[PDB]
Amino acid sequence: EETRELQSLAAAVVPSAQTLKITDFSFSDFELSDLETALCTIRMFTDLNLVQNFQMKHEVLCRWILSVKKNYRKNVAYHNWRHAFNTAQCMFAALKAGKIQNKLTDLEILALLIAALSHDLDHRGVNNSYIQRSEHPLAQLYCHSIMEHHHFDQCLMILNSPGNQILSGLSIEEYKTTLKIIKQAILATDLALYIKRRGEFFELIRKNQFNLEDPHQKELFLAMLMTACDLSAITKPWPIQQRIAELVATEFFDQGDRERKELNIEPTDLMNREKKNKIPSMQVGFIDAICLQLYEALTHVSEDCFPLLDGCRKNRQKWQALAEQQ
Ligand SMILES: COc1ccc(-c2oc3c(CCC(C)C)c(O)cc(O)c3c(=O)c2O[C@@H]2O[C@@H](C)[C@H](O)[C@@H](O)[C@H]2O)cc1
Numbered sequence: 001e002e003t004r005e006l007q008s009l010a011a012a013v014v015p016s017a018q019t020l021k022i023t024d025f026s027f028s029d030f031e032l033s034d035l036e037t038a039l040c041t042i043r044m045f046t047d048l049n050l051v052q053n054f055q056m057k058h059e060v061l062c063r064w065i066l067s068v069k070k071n072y073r074k075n076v077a078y079h080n081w082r083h084a085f086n087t088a089q090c091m092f093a094a095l096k097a098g099k100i101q102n103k104l105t106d107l108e109i110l111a112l113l114i115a116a117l118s119h120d121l122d123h124r125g126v127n128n129s130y131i132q133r134s135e136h137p138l139a140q141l142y143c144h145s146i147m148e149h150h151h152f153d154q155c156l157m158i159l160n161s162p163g164n165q166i167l168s169g170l171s172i173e174e175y176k177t178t179l180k181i182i183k184q185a186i187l188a189t190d191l192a193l194y195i196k197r198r199g200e201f202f203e204l205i206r207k208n209q210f211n212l213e214d215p216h217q218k219e220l221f222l223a224m225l226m227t228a229c230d231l232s233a234i235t236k237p238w239p240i241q242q243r244i245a246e247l248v249a250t251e252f253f254d255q256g257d258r259e260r261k262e263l264n265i266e267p268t269d270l271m272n273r274e275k276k277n278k279i280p281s282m283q284v285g286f287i288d289a290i291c292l293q294l295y296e297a298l299t300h301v302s303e304d305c306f307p308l309l310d311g312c313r314k315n316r317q318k319w320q321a322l323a324e325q326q
């Protein structure tokens, strides 16, 4: 049944953040049941003071979380509920352990958590923005569909569904503002927009010009933070990192098989199952081109986010070792 879920969740005792280990950057969701990931999510909203400050009724928050989880597809190897959940957990860790919570307003935090959980809702296993030839230093290409996505639209649909209105406690103006931030946060998770706007952020950081209170720069930082959390699987302790990387590869190969049948074209190497041997070199190219500079830059705003950079570095070394073939 579909309510046996709400029934169990609404009545369950929500363990502390410490007990749930959600404050750790090295957090793993693998050992948790779906119910436990929902409890972890309730704790995130609670410890960031969102339930209290925004007058969220318990049953409403529970129904919303379940609705979000239900709208992801378990048959998609990587971009599913566990990815969204991990993205939100990383956001929680960055806000708490990284001390980013005091740098932002409660409305921004509310928007970020909702965005983290909802950003990949319109994912059917079709990756429309990625890097081709990452293993080729001088020939890497960033590709993206000419058409756009409806991730925000799905997020809005759930937020406005009867019984799921976790934003009903906001004022008319607060509601409008918050929706704008959520939309921008979700759009920011598209690699295309990240690649497009990161230069400005890196330059500000390099020149010690980053100003939290400049609205334009605040927006830019929130977009960068979203990407940092979205890509955080790449920073986990090696064994966790590799398990997640296998999922990403599986999804990519499944896409290549599908586009082969639907478009009669051979997939780029990234989505070609027969090119598995090249994975380590591809992982290294991706980390160098997209991840390392972002995690380095984040440490300049939040020194305590160092674990993300540290993990990214360690994993690059291990992937590189494999590329050279141990
Ligand atoms: C385990 O943590 C990971 C995080 C991201 C990735 C990842 O790898 C990539 C690799 C490495 C080779 C592989 C066989 C994986 C490429 O060669 C080219 C890419 O564009 C990506 C990529 O976009 C990507 O990011 C993931 O997919 C992209 C599509 C998403 O936008 C992003 O959020 C994330 O989920 C892999 C592992």
Ligand SMILES: [Mg+2]
Binding pocket: 079, 120, 123
């Ligand atoms: Mg995605």
Ligand SMILES: [Zn+2]
Binding pocket: 083, 087, 119, 120, 189, 230
């Ligand atoms: Zn994502």
